[PDB]
């Protein structure tokens, strides 16, 4: 068999059937004779390719396979890889290299130093030393991406390798099963359970890794048994809990002092599937107040090492959440009371307040909608106003890297054909990966894109307001016509200048058979 | 003085007055109190930021200063950095880092391992160990980017550094002058000159570094004195010679066997300011034929080391070209005859042949136009059909990385306000950095964008045709409306479906006061 | 031809005839059928291998070829590579890799990530993508090591590559000549010369790169014409000037404030072939005093970039020194007066004062002796007391990395069979590369090793005295018998407990036919 044939067999035997890519000449020998059981999803730029794959992987809870062109293609994607790293997204990034005979002279399209290019944003990066090694290296890539803590990996392949004879012994790779589904040993797990059972006022903090593991339901049970309030860890890339559950307390402020104040009086704080902590703004203070101790369960040694406080357990989030939910006692304490609904903000017949947009979305969207957020100045409001009862209902750039939500919303919609995806993206953010729209059009992936247009990089104007920073250039982005951009890429486009039109546009979008972009005129900050 | 004040003074004292950027919160403390003598050029995505800066640097023949946001912003730009590396573009890339107090915990927006991120595509990559070091590190960056062989460099700065007190001794940085304007010693230069003088049938091969040095005129003189044919080295990122000069022989084929055949019978081949060689397609054969010896002058040790044949001299291209042009004797040989004009291809009243487009451009454009090429299947024709008599008249992604020409054409037009820039870009390539259009609109930089629309990734269909590769997915890009995209970003848009309309559109574009995009319906391959 | 045969031919055609190594199984296929015209120099540990090669390269002023075993062998040498980096030593370090078929599984002896191992201490690091590429990669290594600024480079080769068929076109590599012998262009050189000619009180500062280039004699001439005092740049790895010349002012203190004070009143300071500056101790102050300006000539862009003050020219030191020495005018100023001889320190009939040892060496050694220094607390005295009139007469770990002088003295003696090498090494430093002695014994390389034994890490006790640091552990090294160590490795050993015995031992050593070690009982600090 050829390296080509063996590699495709390894992929399908490992459950991979889709290639997200933007092609080049180094990749032609790989893409030729494309398997009929495989599907190729083209995007027009590599940040879009990787973003779509990322959304697909996160929503599907399985690895996504990517094929990019050499150094330039890989480099175009490395902003996307920065989010993928922070979101533990299992992405297998392959890139084509020049033929071995021409790597030395550095012919055009040679990926020099290839493995070093994507670092430090990958778990594993490699170029095989011979054609026969390619399937083995692909096996390594598949497993490195998939093992806890999941993450992106990189494989560079000289284009002449594909047609070479494969090693007959490569068949041993095909059905390899590797498991990291592990939990704390019985003795120490009992100690933990006893500590939660004995807590007088426990609190729970959940991260994105909870949603990735589909441990949401177990976390509800654990919270119910412990009669404990549940917060989402700061800078949240996913939603790990029903936002309308009586225990839910919302998104934590991304500040050291703010979080210690919030947790004050809680004697034991159990953090599950989240970094400790993902702070953002500088909020000097105590990491924890006297009387509060912290216990973190994380799938990622790097997270456990860098936590500035608390004990930590490195294990699988699914296995740990299941175990805890089932072991802990049913506390006699009174179940926490549900947070009151958000107030309705005054709204005139003009520009729309972000709050109004989210209320309307909540009123009109299906109960199993999936939201993506890249409207950076309205995150707090979005979390307060959208009722997300099911898992996999929220996605936000884990590294704060813009250009995520637009493509990722397309990958999410591809992974969940029966759940309406609605991406809420600011006018600034929309541009980073605008060409992603074309993929939704071409494959008729019916994502709804809600563009929040206030003409400025609002979150930056705000941060600059706090720093009392004057004379900062480059904060306004006037003069963009998002309906024209959507038309340019074949996506149906609507405009909403007021509530009447917002309701009308949403009704039309929700009834449409393909992707739709709605440009919303929001108030200026 | 503050680190902020000292750094801006260092920049202006070193001739930098423009910041190409896309801002973030880590960068606010740097951008605040922006100097009135400085100018900020905003682009909507980092590949566009770096591409514009790249064109500006190459055309201006000086370093360009870039400011990006942390890891995600830097990563979005690394495809652009791959071209910059191959084109020796002096780019000073700065990125904002999290405050020092929060780097350890890996707060959101922390650039982890920052210096390793942009490698291997930079000459120098660094994050200073203290705020007071920032000006010194900026000095290092400026000089590393500017010294031969020029190239991109990377500096990461924690945002809390800017307001800190600068080291009083930093003033010694301000007026530092560093020179790499060097040439071969007298004795060995005389030996070289004697070898050229004694050559019976010399040939000259010029690379992009010739145009970068403005050594074009000296190369004409050298060619005239030696009565030698002049070729442009393969995969040419710039134009180093008048394409209508009697000595000019055009662009070399990017193949080993093709080049040795071309040079057969030439006893001495002098290569100046070019890699040896930038091959592309695999064309196995002799590097040089018996009787041909090669001498390379290059500014880049890496080029000299990796040449598979010939002698090499590592020195400044400007200094070497001047010295050779002035020292060599005036050969009694007959001056080479000028290549005959390209034939006129049959053109009906329908879709336009690439050849027709280039002939029309040549007929209508000013004699001092500057072209950019990202129409990958029509490169050979472009070189044959465009009369470029002056330096700085051609630019093409040095690393083959698409997404270059659109933004770079804007930077070129900014650097050369009196020379009409015309970017010829295929429908595929146009998408990679489409959002760059907005910058041309906002700053009224009057670049003309000619979009060659044949609905496919033509060069890939061709390479696949040679490999007889069947069933390759992802090669067609139908359904893009480039006039709508231009409208989306505020650029005047025209359409040319035939020659009559092409002539009309060009006439309008050439008379316009701002940027214009013309979508041209070209024939399908 | 085989890759083995082609590579050895490339080496000999490029002037390499010696392999410094410590062998392993990955290297057997390379070392087998060892060429009869080649010579193998074995050392017992890799720090010793590289140190011997380093001394050989520096003294011979040509590249030295090294062969080490995989990761462990390369890693044992990386302390040696840190000195080599700082001394611009042209070292070609090759290491054997596992067979390509077993690199994937990470068999024992696999060098994982090989090219990344030696960074950042090499100019170039590489593992070829195929056997046929090996000669081309070796060519790249040879030239990267040899081009200005010279430095160590690293090449990893899978052991199965050697027996494979070489590319017939590799013959083009054999006689490649690459030159970096360049100097400042005429116009700017004239400007420099005019500035030196106009200087009212110029001073000259020389670095190791001057001795490496053999530019010593030209620097004497330049100093004589300018009637200028000459200092050696701080932390000096070599001696660039006759220490008894009327212009010589000795070794500069390694402190910022000390150097600016020293240069005060000098209007133009010309630094040649040295970093600016290699400081050591923290001596806060002005980099230069008002009225002093600095001009640096360096072969190394990295040095020019990081100088905190002055103008810089990046060019070949040999070419620049020759040009300046020959162009500058003969100043009418009075030639500087020669520094007075060092005073004779009081010495009883007991332990020897370092000063006494150096005076005695100066009295007894041939005028063309070559010294090495790794007696860290007595450097200042050594420089004052040893008359070194010729080039290549002094070597000291450029990176301050101990374990250099012992092996390097053996390589120096190998390169200069007619010049008596005398290494002066403290009892602490002697241990780092003690096994190097065996190589001197086995090959009868007649280096003299003078061990300065005061029982302590003296320089550390001193630095700790300045920091008033109390309770520092690990500063004493009692209980080492250096005569027994020498006997262990087959080197004749003597002991000197007083001046009478020191004189006697030196007389015997100087008359000996092989290597000799003399243990000297020096006074405790
Ligand atoms: C790739 C990238 N570039 C730049 C930024 C910096 N940045 C920028 C540019 C922001 C403004 C986003 O503006 P928007 O219009 O999408 O939303 P708001 O107006 O609600 O802030 S938020 C922020 O962190 C980033 N995070 N990622
Ligand atoms: C960033 C990047 N991605 C992918 C490619 C691969 N690629 C692609 C996608 C090409 C087709 C460009 O199509 P076009 O429409 O711009 O021009 P033609 O139709 O004339 O080829 S040429 C080529 O090398 C690339 N070079 N750079
Ligand atoms: C490889 C290495 N390890 C440790 C040191 C630290 N070190 C040490 C250990 C010194 C003492 C050398 O002691 P010595 O006996 O050779 O000489 P003195 O007694 O004259 O200082 S000097 C110094 O920098 C070093 N420079 N290099
Ligand atoms: Ca906005
Ligand atoms: Ca096309
Ligand atoms: Ca000692
Ligand atoms: Mg990298």
From Swiss-Prot, chains A, B, C:
It catalyses: phenylglyoxylate + H(+) = benzaldehyde + CO2. One of its GO terms (biological process) is mandelate catabolic process. CDD domains: TPP_BFDC, TPP_PYR_POX_like. Mg(2+) binds at residues 116-117, 119. Ca(2+) binds at residues 427, 454, 456. Residues 376-459 are annotated as: Thiamine pyrophosphate binding. InterPro entries: DHS-like_NAD/FAD-binding_dom, THDP-binding, Thiamin_PyroP_enz_cen_dom, Thiamin_PyroP_enz_TPP-bd_dom, TPP-bd_CS, TPP_enz, TPP_enzyme_TPP-bd. Keywords: Aromatic hydrocarbons catabolism, Calcium, Decarboxylase, Lyase, Magnesium, Mandelate pathway, Metal-binding, Thiamine pyrophosphate. Gene3D superfamilies: 3.40.50.970, TPP-binding domain. Its cofactor is Ca(2+); thiamine diphosphate; Mg(2+). Binds 1 Ca(2+) ion per subunit. Binds 1 thiamine pyrophosphate per subunit. GO terms for molecular function: acetolactate synthase activity; benzoylformate decarboxylase activity; flavin adenine dinucleotide binding; magnesium ion binding; thiamine pyrophosphate binding. Pathway: Aromatic compound metabolism; (R)-mandelate degradation; benzoate from (R)-mandelate: step 3/4. Its EC number is 4.1.1.7. Belongs to the TPP enzyme family. Homotetramer. NCBIfam families: PRK07092.1. This is Benzoylformate decarboxylase. It comes from Pseudomonas putida. The gene is mdlC.
């Amino acid at each position: 068999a050829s390296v080509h044939g063996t590699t495709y067999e390894l992929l399908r035997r490992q459950g991979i059937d889709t290639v997200f890519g933007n092609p080049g000449t180094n990749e032609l020998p790989f893409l030729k004779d494309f398997p009929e059981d495989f599907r190729y999803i083209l995007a027009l730029q590599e940040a879009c390719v990787v973003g779509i794959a990322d959304g697909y992987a996160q929503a599907s809870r399985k690895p996504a396979f990517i094929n990019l062109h050499s150094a330039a293609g890989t480099g175009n994607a490395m902003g996307a890889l920065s989010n993928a790293w922070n979101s533990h997204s299992p992405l297998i990034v392959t890139a084509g290299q020049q033929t071995r005979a021409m790597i030395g002279v550095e012919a055009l399209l040679t990926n020099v130093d290839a493995a070093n290019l994507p670092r430090p944003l990958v778990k594993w990066s490699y170029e095989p030393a011979s054609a026969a090694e390619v399937p083995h290296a692909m096996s390594r890539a598949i497993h490195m991406a998939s093992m806890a803590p999941q993450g992106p990996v990189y494989l560079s392949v000289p284009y002449d390798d594909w047609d070479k004879d494969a090693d007959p012994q490569s068949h041993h790779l095909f059905d390899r099963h590797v498991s990291s589904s592990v939990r704390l040993n019985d003795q120490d797990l009992d100690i933990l359970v006893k500590a939660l059972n004995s807590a007088s006022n426990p609190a729970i903090v959940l991260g994105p890794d909870v949603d990735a593991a589909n441990a949401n339901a177990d976390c509800v049970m654990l919270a119910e048994r412990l009669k404990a309030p549940v917060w989402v860890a700061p800078s949240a890339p996913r939603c790990p809990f029903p936002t309308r559950h009586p225990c839910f307390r919302g998104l934590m402020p991304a500040g050291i002092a703010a979080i210690s104040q919030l947790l004050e009086g809680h004697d034991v704080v159990l953090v599950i599937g989240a970094p400790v902590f993902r702070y953002h703004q500088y909020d000097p203070g105590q990491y924890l107040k006297p009387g509060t101790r912290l216990i973190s369960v994380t799938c990622d040694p790097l997270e456990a090492a860098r936590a500035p406080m608390g004990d930590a357990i490195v294990a699988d989030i699914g296995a740990m959440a299941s175990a805890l939910a089932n072991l802990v006692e049913e506390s006699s304490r009174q179940l926490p009371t549900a947070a009151p609904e958000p107030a309705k903000v005054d709204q005139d017949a003009g520009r729309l307040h972000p709050e109004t947009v989210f209320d309307t979305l909540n009123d009109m969207a299906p109960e199993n909608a999936i939201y993506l957020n890249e409207s950076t100045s309205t995150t707090a409001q979005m979390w307060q106003r959208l009722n997300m009862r099911n898992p996999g209902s929220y996605y936000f750039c884990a590294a704060g890297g813009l250009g995520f939500a637009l493509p990722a919303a397309i990958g999410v919609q591809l992974a969940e054909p029966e759940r309406q995806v609605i991406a809420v993206i600011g006018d600034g953010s929309a541009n980073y990966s605008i060409s992603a729209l074309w993929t939704a059009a071409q494959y008729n992936i019916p994502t709804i894109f809600v563009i929040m247009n206030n003409g400025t990089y609002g979150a930056l104007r705000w941060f600059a307001g706090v720093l009392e920073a004057e004379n900062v250039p480059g904060l306004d982005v006037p003069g963009i016509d998002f309906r024209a951009l959507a038309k340019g890429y074949g996506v149906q486009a609507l405009k909403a200048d007021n509530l009447e039109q917002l309701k009308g546009s949403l009704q039309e979008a929700l009834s449409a058979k393909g992707p739709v972009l709605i440009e919303v005129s929001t108030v200026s900050p």
